[PDB]
């Protein structure tokens, strides 16, 4: 089979995880989607020459049992890591996600991207500044993203994919 890429979407309630992956997988914005529905997606995309398959998790917090999140980390090979520019809790919350993978995976080497959405909204709280100075402090990029207009999406998921592709290959 062609390759597949495992990615999972993590953040807070609200930041538009499901309009990313929606926007992905079906090229439209989606003004609401169940904040409380998680699901897996698929597309065949091509990056970088490379015909692949994105599996795409879009999360929604807790599951039932723990173990169901612990599986899909342990599982998952690369995480957006999303907050809202104008949310800056889910901006906080970017640590704890960040601390929960690398936790649940036992590894300091995990393929992440920094996703700030909604950048269409003047509407700000967090400035590029400080998100790249959290990205900068993990070593990992920061894209900012409109799930609205599309700007940013693919790069995004694609700036994943690539960074799963370097460490696949140590
Ligand atoms: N303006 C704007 N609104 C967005 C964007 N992405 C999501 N939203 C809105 O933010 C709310 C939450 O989005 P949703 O995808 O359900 O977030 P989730 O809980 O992280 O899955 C909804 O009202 C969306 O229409 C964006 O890029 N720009
Ligand atoms: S679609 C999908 C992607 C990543 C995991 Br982990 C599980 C399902
Ligand atoms: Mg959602």
């Known amino acids: 089979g062609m390759t597949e890429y495992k990615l999972v979407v993590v953040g807070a309630v609200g930041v538009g995880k499901s309009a990313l992956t929606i926007q992905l997988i079906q090229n439209h914005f989606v003004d609401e989607y169940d904040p409380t529905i998680e699901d897996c997606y698929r597309k065949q995309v091509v990056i ?10 879009d999360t929604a917090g807790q599951e039932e ?23 800056t809790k889910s ?43 959290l990205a900068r402090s993990y070593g990992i990029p920061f894209i900012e993203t409109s799930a609205k207009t599309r700007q940013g999406v693919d790069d995004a998921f694609y700036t994943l994919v690539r960074e799963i592709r370097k460490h696949k290959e140590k």
């Open 48 to 57: 970088d020459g490379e015909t692949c398959l994105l599996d795409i998790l």
């Open 91 to 133: 901006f906080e919350d970017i640590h704890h996600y960040r601390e929960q993978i690398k936790r649940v995976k036992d590894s300091e080497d995990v393929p992440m991207v920094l996703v700030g959405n909604k950048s269409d909204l003047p509407s700000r709280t967090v400035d590029t500044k400080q998100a790249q100075d």
């Open 65 to 87: 049992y723990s173990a169901m999140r612990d599986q899909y980390m342990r599982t998952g090979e690369g995480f957006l890591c999303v907050f809202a520019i104008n949310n």
